[PDB]
């Protein structure tokens, strides 16, 4: 029986990225959320009066809904929007969750992984340069305060949504001194400040022969930012691709959701699968205190994708995005 | 026959047999090089072995490979290495590096007749070894900030990628795909990628393609198949990785995995398991891999008859009936009856 | 990280509810949270049947969070300071000035009208650290401590409280008369602590026995009392019988780094023995005390605003301050005034 | 205990003589000393070469003991640019950041400019003395070197606090801003604004070091003290060292919070007993002062500017033609007539 509406920013992104942003507008006024976009348009993902338009409208709000670009760029976590997200507003930590979903033919069943990845160090602050012609050099940075805050994050959202396993993903055998740091920092961190929770590591070459063949072993990853995007990939195939990939990106004063594969492989007029834009979109209704309308949305997609009817075509149906956003809206007004 | 690393060939001037080095290593080394002799002997190929010790040496504290070894293998121009042990630096990292050894060709191909989790992957990956992390340097900046220096250049990276392409002509496929991470945020990948496009043209029969490290294991795991007719080249930053989640595809684990260490003129063949110690004497090791290897080590060589004789058939097939396999593939056999069972279709 | 755990937005705040009329206060709290709609997420802890494994919980807990809401349990213990989490606190987080905010409510009926002191008492030494022994039989031997460092930020954090909150008076309270050295040094150390840091801030003494007695027959004479651990328990409840009892007095404990909300009286004459009936006013203005800490604070004003307006109005009060309500009435009533408000 | 080690009265001093020629002028201040009878005691280390990792570790050891120390030279190249071992170690154990060196015109030495006083101050822990160098191509070698703001805090107050003690009233920075205008230009920035908030009545002033060498051998009385990174210290220390006549006549000391040790300033950058005690003695007398002896130290510096004064017993190296044990007596002689 509330009293206000939340002002939410929201970054549609490109063509496909309106089309899945534009199922959550709907759906959420049909099921009428008290939440007022604040829609910003970015044309790039570099385009310099957008994203400084998105980046003082997250100061404002603090809570963000994202699309996609499908550029390279956005894919990967540069371009100027990603980098504003990260150098000014400092969200430092990715999360995807790798759920596998009740109606979609999987070759390996029942998957239930999050990978939660640095994001203001590594490959994205390093210094590239050719000094001598046919010579590049690349000097990356590994330090331990980044490195305890991923680390507590990825302990506290363990907690918080009862997993019981944190694993960190690394390469110390080769980088014994960078990736040594990260693996001690999060074992430390794990006995000294989380007991009740089962940390552990693994060598990232031996994750992703693990991850393809026994998946289940894992709980929470967590990594560096070089090694999250092929463990989001890993899992994104898993569970029967990008389409159906939530996330989240976290800062302390911040957070912006959004598809967590970045849809990176997800061609037409509304035939895009929605649900990772759906699915993120339910993460930020948790996070605002809403989430009885959280677990409605939720039960409804899980239900429509559950029977093969209205499916989008990625996942066997051959519905379009619009007609599978109906389907779920009207499974929204007779619940 | 790839003209990058090809082999200088020559008999022995006597016996009519090529000499090659062996290192049996050690672990289940010993056991399973017995298997490899015993079906080379079997199916009566052109060569007499000659066995190598390359026990880590050190020369001013730095690891050196013993002379023995050495000599030989620079001779021979050829060797044949099966697992060994974990001793001050990598044993493996020295080994390219004396023999001049620029490329590892990784394939990972399903066994026909062997249920596993993915069907009808046949990958080959080829990556660099001589820079990228493996020539990399860490230090500490301040207090609390590892860093780390990488270094690609455009020589190594035309010469895998060379490489690449006389081996994608050499075994019949029309696609070569590099494999890179975000080319404009990263000017190394970029480098790698503009080698690979003025190759290019020195090889019109070969279609090149690029794809972004993100898509292609997003591909790969969703489609093994659609790689079949391709060969991947990746910079050294990202070879661990890629051929690792291949092995995943095809087998599981690294159990049924041959490697190949091309070299200017030395070429290493090797399986990448390890040395299992605990499982060693017990007669329970897998030769496959070693076998498989030396079916690689064959064709580099030229006996392309033997080399389908003692894989066309032989392990193959006789990976197919539960009674043979072995403990690791959920069988019942014998490194000894699994041997001969193999010499039976031979 | 020195900092208030917090996540998009989201704080993370340890809550310790207590026994079950501490849970009954906790949830009015967690009802009028909900209802506003605050960022905050509780990280509950469950200290079952001064048990051991639960005391280390909620350390653990606010060596995470660094920001606490605490309940009461009505034994003895909790209520004077000692049993094993108020030790905990005081010896593993270091939190050593327990403040207590005695301000008289619009409808509330009292003997002296409106009273408006604060009482900062030091909680890591004096009783808090002594030892005592029985050495010879029949005879009981008392060793107390009374240092400079810990009675420098005793006295720095009342002056900076006063500075902050446009106090103008700042009474060290304390026993000279007698303990010439060791409440001789109390004494002195605030009052130079006065003089030379702090000179826009009136300081004074006063001997703690003619504390009490001005206490009960002239209140408005104080501003802020600061008293070492021994005296401040006895002006806390002079304090709350002053302003309607225990049930209406917001509490505070700080240390560097972390800092504890809870009721400053430990609902000490807090009986009202039943189900459904105790007051839980005290346990709200803590709790609008956390959120001006966190920096909410707008929050804080709505609530605080709606329960004066709510007690102003002798409807669905309480029964402690002559109401008939229960707790639930009462908050409920609250939340009401919050939708329209 | 962050206090000199002292007994009675009496101090534990550290003493590192060094090579042949250390021995030789270390030798002339334990005779000076004993002559006046001064409340220290000698823990000497020898460093040999034929034991010196195990050398450097009790000289290590012993300073932080003593916390004060006297060290010669070494004149292999190493000693003399402030690398090798001990250099290290004072550096990277002890955390000595400041090098300070002397450089006043002596009474009876003949020098093109006459009436020489200013003091160079060098950063002693970064830059040169932190770097990383790779060969990771054959035939190109690269340097990373860092250049922090806390260490150049720590570098400007010392010399700050250096002027003001010592009566100085210009603090120059010299740097390379023009060109490294990141990293040289932090250290002019930090340099001078620690200049106008923390130390009013000290002028600062900045100087490129390209035109600081032309202006030192030509005008060198405009400066007073000059403050620069390592990379720079050597080379207007050197300077410095020719303005005044040699090596032989230049004092110095380093410090670290909780550890001093003094030394010549230039590192005497050979025959039996003719080298100059100059240097080593008078920082000798800088150990002194710090003591709080410095009674002594009056006495001592009296005695060899007055000796040096009149050319009669001067070493060779100043243009007189006696041994460094005639010189050292001829001091120790007008010691006990004073």
């Not at chain 1, 149906?317 to 929204?332: P, Q, R």
């Not at chain 2, 990292?93 to 009808?120: D, H, M």
Request: aromatic share 6%.
């Amino acid at each position: 029986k509330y009293g206000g509406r939340f002002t939410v920013t929201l970054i549609p992104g490109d063509g496909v990225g309106k089309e899945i942003t534009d199922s959550v507008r709907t759906i959420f006024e049909a099921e009428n959320i008290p939440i007022d976009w604040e829609t910003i348009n970015i044309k790039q993902t570099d385009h310099k009066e957008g994203v400084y338009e998105a980046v003082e409208s997250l100061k404002r709000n603090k809570i963000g809904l994202k699309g996609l670009w499908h550029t390279p760029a956005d894919q990967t976590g540069h371009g100027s929007l990603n980098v504003a997200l990260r150098k000014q507003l400092d969200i430092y930590a990715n999360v995807a969750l790798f759920k596998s979903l009740k109606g979609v033919k999987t070759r390996i069943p029942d998957i239930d992984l999050i990978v939660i990845r640095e994001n203001t160090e590594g490959e994205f602050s390093g210094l590239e340069h050719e000094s001598v012609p046919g010579v590049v050099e690349s000097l990356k940075v590994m330090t331990r305060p980044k490195t305890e805050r991923i680390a507590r994050f990825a302990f506290d959202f363990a907690k918080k949504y009862n997993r019981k396993s944190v694993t960190a993903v690394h390469k110390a055998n080769i980088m014994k001194l960078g990736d040594g740091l990260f693996r001690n920092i999060i074992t430390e961190i794990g006995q000294k400040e989380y007991p009740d929770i089962d940390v552990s590591s693994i060598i990232v070459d031996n994750a992703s022969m693990q991850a393809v063949a026994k998946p289940h072993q894992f709980d929470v990853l967590v990594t560096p930012s070089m090694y999250g995007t092929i463990l989001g990939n890993i899992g994104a195939a898993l569970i029967g691709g990008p389409g159906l990939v939530a996330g989240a990106n976290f800062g302390r004063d911040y957070a912006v959701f959004e598809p967590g594969s970045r849809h990176v492989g997800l061609k037409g007029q509304n035939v895009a699968n929605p649900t990772a834009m759906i699915l993120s979109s339910t993460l930020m209704l948790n996070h605002l205190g809403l989430n009885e309308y959280a677990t409605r949305i939720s039960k409804a997609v899980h239900e429509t994708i559950a029977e093969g009817k209205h499916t989008t075509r990625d996942i066997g149906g051959s519905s379009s995005t619009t007609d599978f956003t109906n389907e779920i809206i009207n499974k929204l007004s007779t619940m | 026959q790839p003209s990058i690393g090809r082999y200088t060939g020559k008999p022995n001037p006597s016996t009519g047999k090529y000499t090659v080095s062996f290192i049996e290593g050690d672990g289940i080394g010993p056991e399973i090089s017995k298997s490899v002799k015993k079906i080379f002997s079997a199916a009566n190929v052109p060569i007499e072995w000659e066995s190598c010790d390359v026990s880590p040496i050190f020369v001013n504290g730095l690891t050196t490979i013993p002379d023995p070894a050495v000599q030989s293998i620079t001779k021979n121009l050829v060797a044949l290495k099966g697992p060994l042990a974990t001793p001050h630096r990598s044993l493996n990292l020295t080994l390219r590096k004396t023999f001049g050894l620029f490329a590892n060709v990784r394939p990972a191909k399903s066994i026909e007749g062997f249920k596993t989790t993915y069907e009808n992957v046949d990958l080959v990956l080829i990556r660099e070894n001589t820079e990228g992390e493996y020539s990399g340097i860490e230090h500490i900046v301040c207090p609390g900030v590892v860093q780390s220096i990488k270094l690609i250049t455009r020589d190594a990276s035309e010469r895998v990628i060379r490489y690449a392409f006389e081996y994608a002509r050499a075994i019949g496929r029309p696609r070569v795909i590099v494999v890179h991470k975000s080319t404009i945020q990263r000017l190394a990948d970029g480098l790698f990628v503009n080698v690979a496009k003025e190759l290019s043209k020195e090889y019109p029969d070969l279609t090149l393609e690029t794809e972004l490290i993100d898509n292609s294991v997003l591909k790969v795991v969703t489609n093994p198949s659609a790689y079949t007719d391709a060969v991947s080249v990746c910079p050294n930053l990202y070879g661990d990785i890629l051929s690792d989640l291949n092995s995943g595809l095809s087998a599981g684990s690294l159990g049924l995995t041959p490697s190949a260490n091309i070299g200017h003129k030395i070429s290493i063949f090797e399986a990448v398991h390890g040395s299992a110690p605990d499982i060693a004497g017990q007669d329970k090791a897998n030769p496959t891999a070693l076998l498989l290897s030396s079916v690689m080590m064959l064709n580099h060589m030229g006996l392309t008859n033997h080399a389908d004789q003692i894989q066309n058939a032989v392990l193959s097939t006789i990976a197919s009936g539960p009674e043979n396999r072995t403990g690791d593939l959920a069988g019942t056999a014998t490194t000894s009856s699994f041997t001969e069972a193999v010499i039976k279709r031979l």
